[PDB]
């Protein structure tokens, strides 16, 4: 179960970053996929997930309405589009996948390397 990430870097406010996560070694549809965030030294916080919630994707309270999670079953890819990046989002974003469809991306079994997001 390989989760390889891409995207990120340093931006200003409203930089509208975009992240991608390619998943391999399982059914892209069965496993709930998602992203979580971890500040440089603080506790990890879930960001988003698809296939977790029954009807609509799960978004955290502090990332609602300004983060969008998109799926591409053709290439088995998950995209995260950010909007209005406040300087409090300078952290590491990890792509996770799990065999159980429940909306807790911070406690999912698998996890990728992680990408750095810096906001000035």
């Amino acid at each position: 179960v390989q989760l390889q990430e891409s995207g990120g870097g340093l931006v200003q406010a409203g930089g509208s970053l975009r992240l991608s996560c390619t998943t391999s070694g399982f059914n892209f549809d069965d496993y709930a996929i998602g992203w979580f965030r971890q500040a440089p030294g603080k506790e990890r916080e879930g960001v988003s997930c698809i296939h977790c919630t029954a009807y609509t994707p799960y978004y955290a309270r502090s990332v609602r309405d300004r983060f969008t999670i998109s799926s591409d079953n053709a290439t088995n890819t998950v995209f995260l589009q950010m909007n209005n990046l406040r300087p409090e989002d300078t952290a590491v974003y990890y792509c996770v996948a799990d065999a159980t469809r429940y909306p807790y991306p911070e406690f999912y079994d698998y996890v990728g390397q992680g990408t750095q997001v810096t906001v000035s």
Partner: protein, 612 residues
């Protein structure tokens, strides 16, 4: 011993008085001198964790935790023992969950240190398992009582054996609990939350207490998906009590008793009876004005009814008023209590909805005056139609003598409301200063408060606040479960499908609440529906301060609707009249309340005036 069986009493009263003294010191040292203390708030919250858990233990012992018994009382006697036995076993499972995941939290947070106090955080989390053992003790005693009256089926030695066996398994070989893990048996997919929810509803309608029902729902959800996360979510059982906005829940209760047991409400009623009472239907005006002035000190409708019903009914029936109007007006004027600041329903809403409490108070001030004016107008019309006689005007000497006698009481709202509106005091600092002023009033200006009676009032304040603390800390646990699964978003989509304009959404919400409040008590309803109804109001664009005021006023009607009305029962008890008479007498007076509800629904700018 006979002092262990009353242990939460003297361990909660003493800690309550300590917290009260610490907060008083903080207030004085911040206002009188420009030298605030830094260890006051955190130490007071640390003490309040233990105080609230002791209140929860008292509630467990007395079996006073709120339940919904609309359908529970309709079962036959034979078929009710089985359900009650299962409910007791569910409560036992909740207590063992508390013990295990409080001990784990205590042993996990020994490194994080409280900055101001200098002690480790564990001294807070130690409150969760340490009191829980006590709870188990109380539970067993309660069950023995329940067995002495033939209210259960299992002999209370099997319950003791099961309790000690479960504790020994939980602290010796917890692995044996993996048999109960339901995720090994059921694969419900992504729609497990829509099963546990209905399970929750079943538990709610079979008589399980609201706090224990919510905790069992959380346990079921985490057992059905993945247990490994309940070790991290259980922290919300303690983080929800370390709140400074929650300390105002007991104090506003305490100042609602020290203002009755000190013989203060009699003076206020005498002042109102002097000023009014010579008008057309003057005694009704006296009733409503006394309730309006007393609403600025207490924050509960039941306290208002219990403290003023006998006086008001006696004064009204001295003038030849009929029983129906007496009961109806003294029951309808209660609702002015939880509307004018301070109020406890708005504090509960501000905790649940994460809203500001000063803004909630200022917003809810105006609907109280609208209800007061509407009730005065309706009472005037009723009395002028019935043609009741008019009392002679009070002599100019008495109208001043009564005011001077009940002059120090009238300054309590100016300390509270004037302390909150002017921004000098936060709601909790306002609560503490109101408690201090009530003590000065009852013990040193009117000389009617002793030390033993003050301690008893502190103990019963803790006992009252415990049954709210339990529901608060289990609702906080269940809210994240219900909000990560986006149930409220689906319900909001359904509402928007059925309701076109946001006004239609408001009408549908109000009809739902009015229908539910007929059979469900206000306190239980506020935790039953509000967690799953605030997100809908947020999504459809409704302001949440106005929504809180509207829901408070909508549930305050629910204590007058006579399939289940708490105010009707209280007034019937204090007036020596049938509940049928009180229920029939409040029918004319529901029109002004409905008019107020409508004109604040279609003109929200009325409410959102003082906060802005």
């Amino acid at each position: 011993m006979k002092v262990f069986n009353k242990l939460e009493e003297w361990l909660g009263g003493s800690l309550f008085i300590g917290m009260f003294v610490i907060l008083v010191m903080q207030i004085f040292s911040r206002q009188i001198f420009n030298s605030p203390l830094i260890w006051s708030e955190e130490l007071s919250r640390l003490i309040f964790v233990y105080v609230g858990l002791l209140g929860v233990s008292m509630g467990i012992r007395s079996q006073q935790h709120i339940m919904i018994d609309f359908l529970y009382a309709k079962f036959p006697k034979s078929m009710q023992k089985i359900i009650f036995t299962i409910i007791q076993i569910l409560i036992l499972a909740c207590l063992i969950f508390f013990l295990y995941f409080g001990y784990d939290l205590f042993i996990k947070k020994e490194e994080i240190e409280i900055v101001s106090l200098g002690i480790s955080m564990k001294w807070m989390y130690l409150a969760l398992p340490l009191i829980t053992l006590l709870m188990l003790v109380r539970f067993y005693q309660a069950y023995s009582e329940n067995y002495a009256q033939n209210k259960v089926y299992i002999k209370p030695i099997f319950i003791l054996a099961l309790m000690i066996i479960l504790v020994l398994i939980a602290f010796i070989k917890p692995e044996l609990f993996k048999i109960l893990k339901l995720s090994n048996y059921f694969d419900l997919g992504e729609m497990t939350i829509y099963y546990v929810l209905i399970a929750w509803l079943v538990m709610i309608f079979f008589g399980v207490p609201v706090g224990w029902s919510l905790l069992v729902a959380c346990i079921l959800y985490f057992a059905l998906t993945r247990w490994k996360v309940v070790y991290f979510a259980a922290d919300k059982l303690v983080y929800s009590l370390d709140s400074f906005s929650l300390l105002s829940v007991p104090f506003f209760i305490l100042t609602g008793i020290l203002m009755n047991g000190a013989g203060i409400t009699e003076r206020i009623f005498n002042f109102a009876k002097a000023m009014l009472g010579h008008y057309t239907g003057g005694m009704g005006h006296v009733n409503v004005a006394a309730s309006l002035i007393f609403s600025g000190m207490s924050g509960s409708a039941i306290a208002d009814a219990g403290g003023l019903g006998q006086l008001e009914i006696k004064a009204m029936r001295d003038e030849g008023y009929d029983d129906d109007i007496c009961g109806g007006l003294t029951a309808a004027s209660c609702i002015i209590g939880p509307l004018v600041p301070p109020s406890i329903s708005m504090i509960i809403y501000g905790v649940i909805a994460n809203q500001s409490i000063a803004k909630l108070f200022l917003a809810g001030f105006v609907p109280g005056f609208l209800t007061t004016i509407a009730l005065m107008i309706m009472n005037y019309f009723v009395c002028k139609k019935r043609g009741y006689k008019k009392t002679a005007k009070a002599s100019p000497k008495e109208r001043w003598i009564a005011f001077k006698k009940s002059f120090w009481a009238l300054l309590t709202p100016i300390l509270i409301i004037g302390g909150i509106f002017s921004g000098i005091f936060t709601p909790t600092e306002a609560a503490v200063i109101a408690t201090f002023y009530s003590i000065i009033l009852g013990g040193f200006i009117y000389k009617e408060l002793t030390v033993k009676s003050f301690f008893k009032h502190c103990v019963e304040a803790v006992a009252i606040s415990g049954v709210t603390v339990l529901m608060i800390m289990t609702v906080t646990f269940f809210g994240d479960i219900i909000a990560r699964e986006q149930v409220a978003m689906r319900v909001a989509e359904i509402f928007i499908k059925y309701a076109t304009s946001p006004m239609m959404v408001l009408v549908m919400i109000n009809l739902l609440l009015l229908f539910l409040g007929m059979f469900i008590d206000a306190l239980a309803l506020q935790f039953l529906v509000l967690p799953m109804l605030i997100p809908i109001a947020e999504q459809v664009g409704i302001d949440l301060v106005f929504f809180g005021v509207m829901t408070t006023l909508n549930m305050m009607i629910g204590i007058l609707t006579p399939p289940m009305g708490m105010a009707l029962f209280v007034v019937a008890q204090v007036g020596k009249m049938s509940v049928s008479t009180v229920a029939k007498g409040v029918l004319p007076f529901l029109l002004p309340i409905f008019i107020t509800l409508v004109i604040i629904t279609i003109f929200p700018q009325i409410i959102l005036f003082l906060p802005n």
